[PDB]
Amino acid sequence: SMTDQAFVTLTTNDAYAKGALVLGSSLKQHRTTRRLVVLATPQVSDSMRKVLETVFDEVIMVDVLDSGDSAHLTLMKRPELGVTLTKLHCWSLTQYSKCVFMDADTLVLANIDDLFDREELSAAPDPGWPDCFNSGVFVYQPSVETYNQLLHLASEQGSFDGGDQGILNTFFSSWATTDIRKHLPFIYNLSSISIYSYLPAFKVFGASAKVVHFLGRVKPWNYTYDPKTKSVKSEAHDPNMTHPEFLILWWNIFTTNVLPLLQ
Ligand X SMILES: OC[C@H]1OC[C@H](O)[C@@H](O)[C@@H]1O
Residues that bind a second copy (CB under 8 A): 72, 75-76, 124-132, 160-162, 166, 176-180, 183, 185-187, 193-194, 197-205
From ligand X, Mn ion, ligand UDP, none, interface partner of 69 (C-beta below 5 to 8 A by class): none
* Contacted entry of ligand UDP, a second copy, Mn ion, none for residue 186, CB cut-off 5 to 8 Å set by kind: a second copy
**8 A C-beta contact, residue 91 and residue 85:** no
Burial of 179 (0-12, 13-18, 19+ CB in 10 A): exposed
Using CB positions, name the residue nearest to ligand X: 163
Tell me the site size for ligand X, rule CB under 6 A: 12
Instruction: Residue 54: name the closest of 67, 38, 31, 77 by CA.
Output: 38
Does residue 38 touch ligand UDP according to CB under 6 A?
no
Q: Is residue 33 classed as helix, strand or coil in its secondary structure?
A: coil
Query: What number of other Cβ atoms are within 10 A of residue 116's Cβ?
Result: 18
Q: Which is nearer to a second copy, 24 or 163 (CB)?
A: 163
- Look at residue 104 and give the partner it binds from ligand X, ligand UDP, Mn ion, none, a contact being a CB closer than 5 to 8 Å depending on partner kind: ligand UDP
**How far, in Å, CA of 166 to CA of 72, rounded?**
10
Does position 73 interact with ligand UDP (CB under 6 A)? The reply is no
What's the min distance (Å) between Cβ of 19 and a second copy? 22
Residue from 136, 158, 162, 220 that binds Mn ion (CB under 5 A)? 136
Which helix (H) or strand (E) covers residue 211, if one does? strand 211-213
- Helix 46-55 × helix 14-29 angle, to 10°: 10
Binding track over 161-200 against ligand UDP, x by CB under 6 A? ----------------------------------------
Secondary structure of 108-144 in the HEC alphabet? ECCCCHHHHHCCCCEEEECCCCCCCEEEEEEEECCCH
Query: Binding residues for ligand UDP, how many (CB under 6 A)?
Result: 17
Task: Kindly give, in sequence order, each residue whose CB lies less than 8 Å from that of residue 51, ignoring residues fewer than 6 positions away.
Answer: 17, 21, 261, 262
Shortest distance in whole angstroms from residue 153 CB to Mn ion = 21
Q: Which does 200 bind (CB under 5 to 8 A by kind): Mn ion, a second copy, ligand X, none?
A: a second copy
The residue within the footprint of ligand UDP, chosen from 206, 216, 239, 244 (CB under 6 A), is 216
Annotated binding site for Mn(2+): 103, 105, 213
